[PDB]
Design a protein around this nucleic acid. Structure first.
Length: 685
DNA sequence: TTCCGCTTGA
């Protein structure tokens, strides 16, 4: 008697809250969800097995009623939870305040079925004021929120389990499609096709080593040719992806024979500065690590895949070193802000800390389930003590901890305010007015850069955030002697493939996926054979091409990049009480007036889509990846057959034509690396 | 066969 049962999701927070509430409360953890739809037919209860909609696990013929069963892993969890329910007087459902957390609370309600008072609450900070205010001010279970979550789960089931069989019939069995993984696959595939249709273009100019004597004699820097007789010399940005000069007849593309000619055209010219401006910049510090940015920076700076970053992060959180690592917020508490303030003032002095309270709040709804990943506690464990506490076969724990520490303290520092030079020289070579340009820049005060520097992407490349290129000053009209002129030839480059970091940043930017499943999408798309990793680059497979093509050509809307965003727009309306749970579900599955013109509801419903497309999809066409024509104009295809992928071409044979010529490809040749020359070598032997 | 999402030890 007098005891209270408090259920939260994570055992760590369960132990903390138990410590700060003491006797008369027994705090336990549900470990996330405890029930779900049946994964496969085996998970369907027997007297529901011959139900026509059992393969879906959703009664779609009667207001989309889900068949919820207890997850076999969480069975013991619920056994103890039910038993423990018997010696308390009240039950505090204290899952997190988000949509899935409310749904979990409702599932606990349905599974425990308590006869005692229940109170719904959400604990933010683990302190006596916050916990007291959370317990003394309970609220009701948000059935609109639970309904929105149910709509999300049901849509993802109908999508995955109705579209995937189409893939089994048209492409190959055991293959999968889904709202998130199919769009990730389509992102990678689309970038690869961009790489296949890319045609590089060549363009020259001149690079110059210059000195500074006659200017203000207070010594070797570089410059590049920029304009010829009032006409800019072409650079990589001036060509489209087909090598065509981009919509501009006001640019001249130099070649070797010309660049050398001007290089020797006038070596004795005194270069005369023409125009010069000064540009100071004030760049604000980086927000603290959330799941996405921590995975990206741990990938680019420490070479950790998303999965490993999450393993190490899990150990660091469960052992008390860092805050919860599955989050989508960059806000901090006053305690963390002041902690990073004191550490920054300590290691970098009082002149390198932020003058104004740097708070990095986002824009979504206020109901922040979690906050940014930070070193846990009122005081930050020093990275040296962490260094000696973590040693053995896993120093990576300390490495990622050092990352999170340095980023977090960097978040509450003053801005960096360097300065860049815009140096424009002019002259004449031959008889033509030539314009040279150059840009260097130095950091006056590194600020937060003294603690944290973001790492440029590996395949994308670019200038570092703290990069500095120094050079002497100059005045308008000052003279400059040409030390050396050397011609330089460049070519345009195809767009870069995605790394795990850039893929994750992409998905996040589209508002798809979540902090808990980012690494899971990558694992999934690799496991289904859609994506394989070459170095750090994500390379799509041929059957990824076939699947992706089927999806955009017959289930287009379902793989639109903003599908997820429109869905979220609908579910927000469900959660606000503006729309009913099965209103848009009925519209989406069976058809009707609803949403954008391209919506599945307008197109007649997902059911009608799968029904007519399961009969009228050319499997040959879906499994024939159009590449290019040969030199005789005969098309060349990558056909994905039961024995793997083979390169096919229709040939003129003995008694005329047509006859297939085939040559199957080892998976070691990426799609873009297969040119026509490669294709006819493979066709040869 | 197949989904997304929440969370840890199977």
């Amino acid at each position: 008697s007098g005891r209270r049962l408090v259920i939260v999701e994570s055992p760590t927070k369960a132990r903390k809250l138990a410590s700060y509430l003491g006797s008369g409360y027994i705090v336990e953890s549900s470990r996330g969800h405890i029930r779900d739809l049946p994964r496969a037919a085996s998970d369907v209860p027997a007297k529901y097995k011959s139900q026509p909609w059992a393969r879906l696990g959703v009664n779609v013929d009667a207001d989309f009623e889900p068949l919820y069963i207890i997850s076999p892993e969480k069975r013991s969890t619920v056994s103890e939870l039910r038993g423990l329910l018997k010696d308390v007087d009240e039950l505090y459902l204290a899952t997190d305040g988000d949509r899935e957390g409310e749904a979990i609370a409702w599932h606990l309600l349905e599974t425990l079925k308590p006869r005692i008072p229940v109170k719904r609450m959400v604990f933010h900070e683990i302190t006596e004021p916050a916990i007291r205010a959370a317990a003394e001010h309970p609220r009701d279970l948000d059935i609109d929120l639970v309904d929105a979550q149910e709509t999300r789960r049901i849509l993802d089931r109908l999508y995955g389990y109705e579209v995937s069989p189409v893939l089994w019939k048209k492409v190959a069995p055991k293959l999968s499609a889904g709202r998130v993984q199919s769009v990730a696959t389509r992102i990678i595939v689309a970038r690869e096709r961009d790489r296949m249709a890319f045609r590089s273009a060549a363009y020259w100019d001149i690079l110059a080593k210059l000195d500074a004597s006659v200017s203000d004699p207070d010594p070797t820097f570089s410059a590049r040719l920029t304009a010829v007789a009032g006409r800019r010399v072409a650079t990589g940005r001036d060509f489209d992806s087909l090598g065509t000069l981009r919509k501009g007849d006001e640019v001249i593309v130099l070649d070797e024979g010309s660049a050398t000619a001007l290089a020797a055209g006038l070596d004795g010219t005194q270069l005369t500065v023409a125009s010069a401006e000064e540009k100071p910049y004030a760049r604000r510090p980086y927000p603290p690590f959330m799941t996405s940015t921590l995975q990206q920076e741990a990938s680019r700076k420490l070479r950790f895949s998303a999965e490993r970053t999450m393993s190490i992060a899990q150990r660091l959180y469960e052992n008390g070193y860092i805050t919860y690592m599955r989050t989508d917020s960059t806000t901090l508490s006053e305690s963390a802000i002041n902690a990073a303030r004191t550490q920054a003032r300590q290691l970098y002095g009082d002149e390198y800390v932020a003058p104004a309270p740097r708070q990095y709040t986002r824009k979504v709804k206020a109901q922040e389930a979690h906050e940014a990943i930070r070193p846990a506690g009122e005081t930050f464990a020093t990275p040296d003590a962490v260094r000696r506490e973590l040693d053995g076969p896993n120093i990576d724990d300390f490495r990622l901890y050092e990352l999170i520490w340095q980023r977090t303290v960097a978040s509450q520092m003053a801005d960096a305010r360097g300065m860049t030079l815009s140096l424009r020289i002019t002259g004449m070579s031959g008889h033509q007015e030539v314009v040279f340009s150059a840009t260097g820049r130095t950091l006056t005060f590194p600020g937060f850069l003294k603690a944290y520097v973001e790492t440029v992407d590996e395949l994308v490349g670019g200038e570092a955030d703290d990069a500095e290129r120094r050079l002497p000053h100059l005045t308008p009209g000052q003279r400059l002697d040409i030390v050396e002129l050397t011609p330089d030839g460049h070519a345009t480059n195809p767009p870069a493939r995605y790394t795990e970091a850039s893929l994750v940043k992409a998905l996040e930017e589209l508002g798809i996926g979540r902090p808990s499943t980012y690494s899971s999408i990558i694992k999934t798309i690799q496991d289904r054979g859609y994506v394989h990793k070459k170095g750090s680059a994500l390379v799509p497979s041929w059957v990824a091409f076939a699947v992706t093509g089927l999806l955009e050509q017959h289930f287009g809307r379902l793989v639109d990049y903003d599908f997820t965003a429109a869905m979220e727009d609908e579910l927000d309306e469900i959660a606000a009480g503006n729309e009913r749970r099965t209103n848009w579900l009925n519209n989406f599955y069976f058809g009707g007036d609803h949403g954008v013109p391209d919506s599945v509801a307008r197109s007649g419903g997902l059911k009608k889509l799968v029904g007519i497309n399961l009969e009228g999809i050319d499997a040959r066409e879906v499994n024939s990846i159009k590449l290019f024509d040969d030199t005789h104009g005969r098309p060349i295809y990558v056909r994905v057959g039961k024995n793997g992928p083979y390169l096919e071409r229709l040939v003129a044979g003995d008694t005329g034509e047509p006859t297939p010529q085939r040559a199957n490809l080892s998976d070691s040749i990426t799609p873009d690396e297969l040119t026509l020359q490669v294709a006819e070598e493979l066709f040869a032997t």
